[PDB]
């Protein structure tokens, strides 16, 4: 069992506000098959999905000087099923005009996804769904979008105020601040890890892997599969603008994955620092090709 550092010394989780009416945004965008989107290149040789699900990350409430409580949606109450898998699309509508969610508008920026994959799911003591039992595999972006951590461990909820096993609990979220956690040269790689440790305690960690990612503004696709050997990660290093997945890591996960969870995110910023963020899409990998080599696909039905 690896060592992951200490745990949070805070005695009360930060307050979280949940809203849906201000978060139910209609941005209809289907998927076109002949776009080289979410197509995993065959492995070992050289020669597939729909509106989908949308997830929004927004900065928390704030005043003129000091930021207020967080602001998330009910992206943790809903729990979905892994089945064969799903395809991940990030950085869709950047470089354009978007509202700050919280009339005001700005340029849309890019965000990175965090996942929690496990086999047994229930609900908390309060009666709210989103609790994962036994081992869980968590993929957490770190370093203000310049690092990815992937660990395998059990999660124990905490009994402080606003924490999952405490009083007056709405949801658990990740947060970070741009003034301190992100800086030129002096980037903090353990911000979101500390935000995660604020709510849950990580016990019996079999493995913890790190991958370094360069900053960009490129629309991206991602995927994860499981076979008899282990969990295969399908991204960047070989293809960057064509959107063709490739393998970069194998994770020793032998239990069957049946459910996955998305973790909401927020940035502690004041009104003058509000920047709009990009919607993050996930499409079901229902089991159902023109080459250039890279593929540049038509639905049979």
């Amino acid at each position, epitope marked *: 069992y690896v060592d992951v550092g200490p745990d949070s010394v805070k005695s009360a989780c930060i307050e979280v506000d949940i809203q849906q009416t201000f978060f139910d945004k209609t941005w209809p965008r289907p998927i076109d098959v002949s776009k080289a989107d979410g197509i995993i290149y065959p492995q070992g040789r050289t020669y597939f999905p729909d509106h989908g699900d949308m997830y929004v990350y927004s900065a928390g409430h704030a005043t003129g000087t000091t930021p207020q*409580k967080l602001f998330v949606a009910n992206y943790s109450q809903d729990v979905k099923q892994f089945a064969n898998g799903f395809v991940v699309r990030i950085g869709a509508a950047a470089n354009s005009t978007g509202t700050v969610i919280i009339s005001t508008s700005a340029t849309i920026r890019k965000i990175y996804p965090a996942f929690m994959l496990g086999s047994s799911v229930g609900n908390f003591s309060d009666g709210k769904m989103g609790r994962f039992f036994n081992h869980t595999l968590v993929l957490l972006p770190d370093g203000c979008g310049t690092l990815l951590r992937a660990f395998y461990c059990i999660l124990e909820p905490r*009994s402080g105020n606003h924490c999952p096993a405490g009083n007056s609990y709405t949801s658990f979220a990740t947060y970070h601040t741009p003034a301190t956690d992100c800086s030129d040269g002096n980037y903090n790689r353990n911000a979101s890890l500390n935000s995660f440790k604020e709510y849950f305690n990580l016990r019996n960690c079999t493995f913890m892997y790190t991958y370094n990612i360069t900053e960009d503004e490129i629309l991206e696709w991602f995927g994860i599969t499981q076979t008899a050997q282990g969990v295969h990660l399908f991204s960047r290093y070989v293809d960057l603008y064509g959107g063709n997945m490739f393998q970069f890591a194998t994770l020793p996960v032998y239990d069957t994955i049946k459910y996955y969870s998305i973790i909401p995110h927020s940035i502690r910023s004041i009104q003058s620092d509000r920047k709009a963020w990009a919607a993050f899409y996930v499409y079901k990998l229902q089991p159902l090709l023109d080459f250039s080599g890279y593929i540049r696909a038509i639905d049979c039905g």
Partner: antibody, heavy 115, light 108 residues
Framework: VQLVESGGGLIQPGGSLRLSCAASGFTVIDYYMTWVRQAPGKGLEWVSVIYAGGSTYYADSVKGRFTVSRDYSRNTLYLQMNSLKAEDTAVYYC??????????WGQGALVTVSS | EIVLTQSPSSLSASVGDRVTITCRASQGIRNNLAWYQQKPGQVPELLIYGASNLKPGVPSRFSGSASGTDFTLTISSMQPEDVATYYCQKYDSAPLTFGGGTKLEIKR
């Protein structure tokens, strides 16, 4: 990390006052902070709490007279007292969140309400 | 409303004894009970968080105990130094109510 307080002295009854607590080594917005008073020769008492997210909770014996806030730019914690009476004469402290509520503690400021 | 009754309010100790204090409450507070130590003439300090966990600053002699309904703050051995006033607090919810502080002494 340290906390230094100021703003205490003799005050006539029926008048206001302010207490300021300056924090070094961290930022105020990270952790919740608590104002706690202690009467001379009596026990400890909890005056107010401010949580990350601007949610403030006051005690019943001080409700309607005291107010707690904080300033981000100066990294300060403020407590304003109005309609003071002779009962509100005590040593006050500002405390920072840690393993427990009172992990860091402060130095103390004496407030005397008399004519 | 949850009330925190710290007993005994005055503690008499000898050259040989193990401090044992209790903190009765009228409701459920999860385990969010904090035990503080105040040397008279100085600001108090934290002893134990969660009624069973130890602060890294404090040593391992002052060992907490379980909390069924009452909360026991045990101490392995009695020393001339440990003379202070020990306080309870419930940081479980909005009213963080205190109680009475128990003065310790050394036999002579």
């Amino acid at each position: 990390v340290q906390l230094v307080e100021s703003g205490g002295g003799l005050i006539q009854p029926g008048g206001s006052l302010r207490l300021s607590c300056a924090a070094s080594g961290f930022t105020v917005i990270d952790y919740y902070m608590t104002w706690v008073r202690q009467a001379p020769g009596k026990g400890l008492e909890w005056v107010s709490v401010i949580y990350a997210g601007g949610s403030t909770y006051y005690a019943d014996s001080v409700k309607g007279r005291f107010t707690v806030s904080r300033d981000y730019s100066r990294n300060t914690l403020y407590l304003q007292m109005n309609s003071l009476k002779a009962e509100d004469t005590a040593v006050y402290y500002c405390t920072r969140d840690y393993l427990a509520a009172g992990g860091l503690w402060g130095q103390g400021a004496l407030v005397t309400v008399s004519s | 409303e949850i009330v925190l009754t710290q007993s005994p309010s005055s503690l008499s100790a000898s050259v040989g004894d193990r401090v044992t204090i209790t903190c009765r409450a009228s409701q459920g507070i999860r385990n969010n009970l904090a035990w503080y130590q105040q040397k008279p003439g100085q600001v108090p300090e934290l002893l134990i968080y969660g009624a069973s966990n130890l602060k890294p600053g404090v040593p391992s002699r002052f060992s907490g105990s379980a909390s069924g309904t009452d909360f026991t703050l045990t101490i392995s051995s009695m020393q001339p130094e440990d003379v202070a006033t020990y306080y309870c607090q419930k940081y479980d919810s909005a009213p963080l109510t205190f109680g009475g502080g128990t003065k310790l002494e050394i036999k002579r």
